[PDB]
Amino acid sequence: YFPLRIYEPNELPERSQQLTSGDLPTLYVFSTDSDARLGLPSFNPGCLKWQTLLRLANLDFRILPSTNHSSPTGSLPFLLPPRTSPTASPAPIPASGLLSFARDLDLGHLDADLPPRAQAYLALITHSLRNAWLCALYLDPTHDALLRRLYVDPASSSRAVRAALLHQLRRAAAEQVATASSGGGKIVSLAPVDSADGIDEEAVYRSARDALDALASLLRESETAWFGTERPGSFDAALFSYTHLMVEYMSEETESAKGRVSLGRMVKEAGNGELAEHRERMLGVAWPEWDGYRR
Amino acid sequence: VGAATKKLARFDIFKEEGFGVFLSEAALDISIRVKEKSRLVFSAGTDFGNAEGSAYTNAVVRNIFGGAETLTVNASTGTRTRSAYNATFSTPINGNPDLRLSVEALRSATQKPWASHEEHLTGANLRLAWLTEKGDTHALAYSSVWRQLTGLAPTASPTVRADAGDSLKSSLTHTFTRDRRDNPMLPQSGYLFRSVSELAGWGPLNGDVSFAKTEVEASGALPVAIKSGVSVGGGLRLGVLYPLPLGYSLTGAAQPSRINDRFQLGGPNDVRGFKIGGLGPHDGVDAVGGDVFAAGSVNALLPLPRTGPDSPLRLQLYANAGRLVALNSKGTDKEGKEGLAMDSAAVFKGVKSAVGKLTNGIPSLAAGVGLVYAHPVARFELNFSLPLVLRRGEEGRKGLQVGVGISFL
Amino acid sequence: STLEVHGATNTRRSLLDQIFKPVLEDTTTLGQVLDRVGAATKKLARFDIFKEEGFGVFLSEAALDISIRVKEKSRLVFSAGTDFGNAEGSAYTNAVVRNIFGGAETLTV
Amino acid sequence: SAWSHPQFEKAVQLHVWGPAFGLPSIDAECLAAIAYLAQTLGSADYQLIQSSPSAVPTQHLPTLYDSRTSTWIGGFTSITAHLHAASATADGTAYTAFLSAHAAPLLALSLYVSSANYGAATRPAYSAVLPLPLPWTEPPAVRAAMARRAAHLGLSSLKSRIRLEEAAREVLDVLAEVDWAAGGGGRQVAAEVRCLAFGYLALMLLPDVPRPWLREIMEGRYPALCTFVRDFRARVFPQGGKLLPWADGGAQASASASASASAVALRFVRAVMAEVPLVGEWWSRWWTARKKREVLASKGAKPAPSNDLLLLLGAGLGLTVVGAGVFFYRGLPPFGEAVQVWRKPV
Amino acid sequence: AGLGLTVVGAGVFFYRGLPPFGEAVQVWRKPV
């Protein structure tokens, strides 16, 4: 009862009313400012999956680039509802509940327990293809330009920090590719194998080739341009999340001298090219107007 | 020889107590004595068994060649990552103990509960501290850091979720202090002008922040009438954070400041009667700072009646104040360009309007009563305050306002 | 029934086994409670590698089911505070590694 | 720079762990490989040399070593790639991926994360198959590895059991419809997948496991799984595995030629040098780079020569720290005397 | 060199010594 006068809460600063004013919920995905205004697909698969699923759920939202530190959990692709009061915030919706937040008419088939066979196949997409992507991106030295201009240069613009961040990303990626036994869990002292010298790429590459071929063979049994169903569900989005980024960024035809044809060629050449048409047809339901794909 | 001996003691390598000057009336014949301060002092007490690492290393080599000196502090909690460095190296530049240079490299991990997050600093700064014979003290430092923000564990706020990246902040900052107060830990009769400017990344300075931070602090104090330690006090502060373009110009485009760079005005050390980070443009519960600000005080510091001019343990009767605004543009056409690039005219108009808002309305105007204890090293307030006027969302506080430190009002 | 020794890290299972394999060997006389576990716990505390205050014995009447807790004493404790400048060397080193393999222990002053 | 794909210039001997559970081996990848070879090759050729991680150049255990070309091959999948409608092969690949990931994180929950199990049933099995000084170092590395693989389930030792049984169901409900060993019923898969599934399940079921929750589920809700496991064990591993061609003498005499006191001391000292506070990680990285280069040379290619910057930097940092620590201790001789005297200039 | 190496190696060895031998929970059963 002591405070005698109350005056008009304090007019938040410029960044915090320019970036986070909003009117519609804002999903936070790895992206570049030239893109985030257009809502064009991200360049990280763990976020492109969620972005594609949401866009399929017919939720109206915008995407802002973020930096993997500003999430209620470690991984990025979380969401925030708009402000209701110029100084009050709703709760941040982590990655897991993005579909629950979206609820139109029927949002069941975007998240339903698949028949057991499909959970067996999801292991390909989630582990084999993921290790292949992680290896080819963070370790193959001919992708240093991509890694920089995608994940490092937008951060700091100070070469002595760029270098440290690049080293951090490479160590944290090598630690993940060396856990899943696709390449190998070589056993060293009580510390993970955090280098490209425990991650023999022949095993990972062959596992990737077989995974793509198995998926291309499965897609041929559905006769409805999807993976058993009528409208693309969770599995098709999880597949797209990788089969696109493996085409836009790693389809560099050089390769004939070193052999080991780069991923995008295998992706478009899986089976008889069914994954390529599948991706080019998911672009046509999610982004009905976007062009520029196929590099 | 008084000047000689004082200049000698200013080296900070001779033990303070015990000098001696022995004049032997033989047939001048002056004889000076000194004690040496020390040399390498060490400590390394570690513990283990569980998460405790407590690597606890300390080292001081008081004199390597001339006046040189290397401090090396360390720590490893096993819970926190590390504090692997804090390494200073001081040495007077061949001319006097007055012009002292020091080079420091650090790697620490602070904490900021009022705007919930951490901050990892891993820079290294270069400092050149003069000292004029009149008592004034200039300094000049070049600091280059990393400034990572990695602790947004609770529901923090959409503000810090948007300012949680990295930076460099290579900057060149220059302090200044004129100290004319009798007891620096309990001012009664002197005055104290202290000005700390700073220019961050601009022109030759490269980085990702570009501002110009000015922080003026005046003072005052006076005992009036019936050794009667009345000691009427005073105080004031100011400040501005002015953003600038990124190179060799004044007219250009500036990006507004990050939470790593704004001021925070509140707490037992700056404006008593508030949370450690009260008085802000608060967002939810996290205290986002501002650029312009101000302060105030009016003290009494009366000694315990019927006790006499005893050790300095006195009642503190003080009003107070405080204000802290933010750089809202809201006065030009919409940027059109995507987001954060304000032209020079808009920045100037914004700061003019912000200072205009600083002088509209009574600021906060706390109060209190406290028992000040003037230790030579620190000052202990123990106030009991009563915040009069608040802006909605400034986290008033009303209990016992315990405070310890050096800087106060 | 069972017997659980929570917290007893950094000590071989064979060491605790050498004591607790018998404790379950003689446990008829079920109609009442007979706790030679006092002998077990005192013999355990005699190792001088478990912190003295706080043991606990929690009997869960589930369908014996004795549950023991312990705290660990510590591991490597260090100190080295030296001074110089004059005749003082005060090299002052101390070390205690409470448990290297089993009950082993090295003091070095 | 030891963080990129390596640059290049322009009668097998299956090393496995010891039996240790009433099965031909442990570490279900190893048991899978050994069952596949036992089915495919014949007891005349392979040698089943008992081994350890530090005893091979690949550092990966279920490791084949050809004799004709002297090439090291690691991992079960690479091995079975060596030594060699479409829905058959498709499902084969699918279930191979699904067993390698999401089934191994279960055999960790049991037997490596449950501290009531790792210490009562596992660490004895590891100590029973290793030379004397090693078990202080290697079983903990294996446990840390299987624990890291066990995360991404969110479960550890903390009614905290119904969720565990739910986790186990979430895998067995997919592994159940496979119709593993049958001439009819569900779907055929493959030889090299069937053997892998046997390896994983037989370590899920057959151990003694003082605090069991996999045995109860697999015996209560899944008849075909336990039936398959028991029949496979009784078919291809009669008498627990004494008919398999181990090295010169069998189980223990196999890791005798490669276990001289010198070699075992080397294993120990390497595994402990990789743990020093500062030079440890850099030494481990240099060593692993060297061993990968050696394996690659063996396979038939020529790697980049070397980049000794790793160990050079590690040694330089260690030397700098210790030399600075020793230098300032009794630093340079004193520069100033006890008495210093000036005179009046004349 | 042997004395220097012995001192420094003993100092470094016991700092983060051998991996722990005992788990958090260890369980015995009733023999049947």
Author numbering:
A (entry chain A): 26 to 128, 139 to 262, 264 to 289, 292 to 333
B (entry chain B): 87 to 113, 126 to 324, 330 to 512
C (entry chain a): 47 to 73, 78 to 113, 126 to 171
D (entry chain C): -32 to -23, 2 to 75, 105 to 178, 237 to 424
E (entry chain b): 393 to 424
Give sentences from the paper:
3D reconstructions for the SAM complex in GDN showed a mixture of monomers and three predominant dimer conformations. Among the dimer conformations, substantial differences were observed for the Sam50 β-barrel. However, in dimers 2 and 3, the β-barrel is open, allowing for association of strands β1 in an antiparallel arrangement, extending the β-sheet across two Sam50 β-barrels. All of the dimers appear to be non-physiological, with an up-down association of SAM complexes not anticipated from functional studies. Our structures illustrate how Sam50 can open sufficiently at the lateral gate to accommodate precursor binding at strand β1, positioning L6 at the lateral gate through its interaction(s) with strand β16.
The SAM complex facilitates outer membrane β-barrel precursor protein folding and insertion into the outer membrane. The SAM complex consists of one copy each of Sam50, which spans the mitochondrial outer membrane, and Sam35 and Sam37, which sit on the cytosolic side of the membrane. Sam50 forms a 16-stranded β-barrel which is minimally closed between strands β1 and β16. The structures of Sam35 and Sam37 reveal that they each adopt a GST-like fold, which is also completely different from the BAM lipoproteins.
